[PDB]
Design a protein around this ligand. Sequence first.
Ligand SMILES: NC(=O)c1ccc[n+]([C@@H]2O[C@H](COP(=O)([O-])OP(=O)(O)OC[C@H]3O[C@@H](n4cnc5c(N)ncnc54)[C@H](O)[C@@H]3O)[C@@H](O)[C@H]2O)c1
Ligand SMILES: NC(=O)c1ccc[n+]([C@@H]2O[C@H](COP(=O)([O-])OP(=O)(O)OC[C@H]3O[C@@H](n4cnc5c(N)ncnc54)[C@H](O)[C@@H]3O)[C@@H](O)[C@H]2O)c1
Lengths: 242, 241, 242, 241
Amino acid sequence: MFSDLKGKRILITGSTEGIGMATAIELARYGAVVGLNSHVDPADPALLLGKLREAGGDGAFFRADITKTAECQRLVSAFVERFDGIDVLINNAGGLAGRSNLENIDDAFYDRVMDLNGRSVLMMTKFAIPHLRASAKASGTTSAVISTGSIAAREGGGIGAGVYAASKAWLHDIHRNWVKEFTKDSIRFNIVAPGTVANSIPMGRFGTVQELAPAYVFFASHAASGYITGQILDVNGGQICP
Amino acid sequence: MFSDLKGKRILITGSTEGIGMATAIELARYGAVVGLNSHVDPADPALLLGKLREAGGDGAFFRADITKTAECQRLVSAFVERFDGIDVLINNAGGLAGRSNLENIDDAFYDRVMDLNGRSVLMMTKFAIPHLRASAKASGTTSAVISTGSIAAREGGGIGAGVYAASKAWLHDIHRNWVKEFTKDSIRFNIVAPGTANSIPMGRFGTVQELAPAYVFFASHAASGYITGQILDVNGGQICP
Amino acid sequence: MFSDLKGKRILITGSTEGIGMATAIELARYGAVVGLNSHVDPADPALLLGKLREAGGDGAFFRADITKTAECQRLVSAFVERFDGIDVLINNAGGLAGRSNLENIDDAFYDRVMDLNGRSVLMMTKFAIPHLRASAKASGTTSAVISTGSIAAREGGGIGAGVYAASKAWLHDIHRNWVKEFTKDSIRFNIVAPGTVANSIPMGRFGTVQELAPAYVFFASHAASGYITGQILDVNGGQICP
Amino acid sequence: MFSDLKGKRILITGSTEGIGMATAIELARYGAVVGLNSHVDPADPALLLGKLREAGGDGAFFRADITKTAECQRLVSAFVERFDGIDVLINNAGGLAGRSNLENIDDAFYDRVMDLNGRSVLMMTKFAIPHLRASAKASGTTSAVISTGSIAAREGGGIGAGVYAASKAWLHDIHRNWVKEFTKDSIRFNIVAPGTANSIPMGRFGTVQELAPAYVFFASHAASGYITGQILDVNGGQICP
Ligand SMILES: NC(=O)c1ccc[n+]([C@@H]2O[C@H](COP(=O)([O-])OP(=O)(O)OC[C@H]3O[C@@H](n4cnc5c(N)ncnc54)[C@H](O)[C@@H]3O)[C@@H](O)[C@H]2O)c1
Ligand SMILES: NC(=O)c1ccc[n+]([C@@H]2O[C@H](COP(=O)([O-])OP(=O)(O)OC[C@H]3O[C@@H](n4cnc5c(N)ncnc54)[C@H](O)[C@@H]3O)[C@@H](O)[C@H]2O)c1
């Protein structure tokens, strides 16, 4: 029972596939209204919305390359134009964007990874704060941000992935800064931290997207996680037990 | 969608009131057969079965003092005699059991606190294992332990409660041990860590109602099937680890 | 330069060998006065004191089985009788005291490990607090406790070692409780956390006692670590990077 | 006994004042040849060499702006031209570079903060590596990086300083990455994490004098030769992780 998610307007960056899409459908199951998003158009946008509505909810697609601040602005504007505000921001866009030994790491590499995993999440969240704040007065209860983190935030990632690791630790920490700045506004901030999606994983296998979605649902519903904020749930098969 | 909780046999310690009852109820909402528990008999046993049954499930009460190892064995054997198995165990029993500054701590105090928060958890978990082992063999999925931690494990607790604090740090960490030993038996282990009020960002205290959903989440293979060895801190941001 | 350790009276439990003895000698190098200790008499007590004095300092041996509270009392009494107080308590006694799969863990096993790693450190520290407090008024500066922890406090130890792991996490946390109770008394509390003393260790080898001693020296000198309290230094070759 | 610091070539960024100078001095006490550094020329360069020389060692000042990657390369090349190597690098440069609430953060702010605390560290470390690689090959022991972290990496920092906070969390964690890549080159990485006053158990602030010894400890193979990937928090108990 996440019935308090019916009608909730939930914007998810980087959600035309993987964890993002699977989460979109699970939110849809409780009748949520979901902004899908990506930097390039999917092959079949209607089919994705079909899957949402099929599952019991609704939504629209919005294309934006959120490694640019302007685009994060434009994306929040559009979703808010279409529906009238945001009840939940899910920062899911992110990713490696390459591996490089430290000695071959030039400025471009740094900038690529940090725009994808750093600036994007900062700026998206910034532009959504206004609407999330207002969303929360209106409901009475709370708005939410959920950001996708990583096991790499904690243990430094694989070789090649130092910047990605660091960018994720950057996120885990900046959430703690936002719990300070915005709990008075009744906006909660939580992280799902995938791990990888064997045999340094106690369970002996990589996760499936269907195994990551429920946690997002959990942090999304105020009825289920209303007292929880500034926490990190690692969904990694025991791979790290912090 | 917690429908896989239908018929799940869920023994809960320290469950006649507080977080324990709340959690029993919420689980009972999904057709869980819950074992309620306390050292003392409660005033109205059948209300409590009522609440479970009202909510959508079933259960039974067992008196037992878990600060003792024979009692723990008994409780697990009683629960199994009644329901033929364990699918989820929830180590919720625990508490301060007094307050004392270091200079005033004797063996009796230390023994009281650690028997309540350490030995209990250890032994309950020890005796449940082969039952939980068998459940997951049968279901094809995973069985589950959940235990009630505390903010105090992370930041040391408050003056006079060092032993309780450390008992909780002890639990947090021994759960990491069990992940190593038992993940191959398809048994998951997770912890719900209640916080304790101008040091709590949400300006206020938790309520049992705000705690129980967490436990439901960790109890369900469909929800948290790939999650083990974690601690979900439910505390209005009191600490953000 | 740890010249501020000359004459400092430093009681170290479980110090007739391993990390304990090596630490004793390194403190001795700066002219400290060191209580050695163990639950059984060494073969040659004079040779150990010889090594202390040889290195540039002094001390005495005190036998006590500190798994009993009475003995911790008796041990602190004796060291304080001999010298007139304690400037530094080093809780080094501890250890596995067996491995057991959880299903074979009876009460005795629990009790053995917890007395060795839990009650001992609690009670030793308790009985020393009085004297450490007074030591600190007299000096002006600070007293110190240093406790030997473990990598196992953080990641749950090896199979068989769950109670030992847990007992060490217990210690890491209870120190945080004592930073609260006793910083007003100018008593600092720090932990050295050995790890193991290969190839899940970046350095590819186990530590040597000579590689653990310096850290104890560091936390022992007020001139070097006077502003540091409630911290844990892991000395493990990168084995865990918290 | 830090005698192995004799003749060690120790490039330090952000070292004309504060923790950086203090640390240079203390290292200079053991016969270290230190590289002082700032974006701006200081008033009296030779006093500073004086302090190093007085204390027991030697050194040289290099102007460079490390928020820029070409400048970082230059500094490492300059330092090597002068002293023929690097044995220790200390990434101490960094700071708030302004304060801003989230709703007022533009790209320029973010770029300013991360260039100062992220790019700098990364690039300094990148360019030093092969020098540090060569030192440890020659010594037979280990060479060393030390970097100045912050309490803020752990608890989020204060309102208006999110980016700085996260920049420090970023550093803490990338040091873990480097341990993996570079431990086999015998290069250690450790972090000294200054705290920032009724939330500090010692009722008071740190002083540069209370900070520098830590750095000395991490700088010496004899002292900290088996220590890598750690963060020593110097903060009067402000946080106890
Ligand atoms: N609420 C807080 O401030 C806080 C903070 C940190 C942790 N916790 C943890 O929350 C958990 C549960 O607390 P609670 O909500 O049930 O509060 P509570 O006051 O209701 O605890 C009493 C409950 O546990 C049972 N109980 C007590 N001793 C028992 C024993 N020896 N054997 C069997 N049952 C026993 C009682 O009968 C009752 O059901 C504990 O483990 C506690 O350490 C609470
Ligand atoms: N003291 C605190 O409150 C506190 C708390 C957390 C972290 N820190 C960290 O302490 C470290 C050092 O602080 P500090 O003691 O030197 O204080 P500081 O005020 O002295 O910092 C200025 C120093 O760094 C140099 N510097 C500044 N920008 C530079 C640049 N672009 N290139 C080269 N050099 C530059 C200055 O010339 C000077 O030597 C920083 O990384 C900071 O983030 C400090």
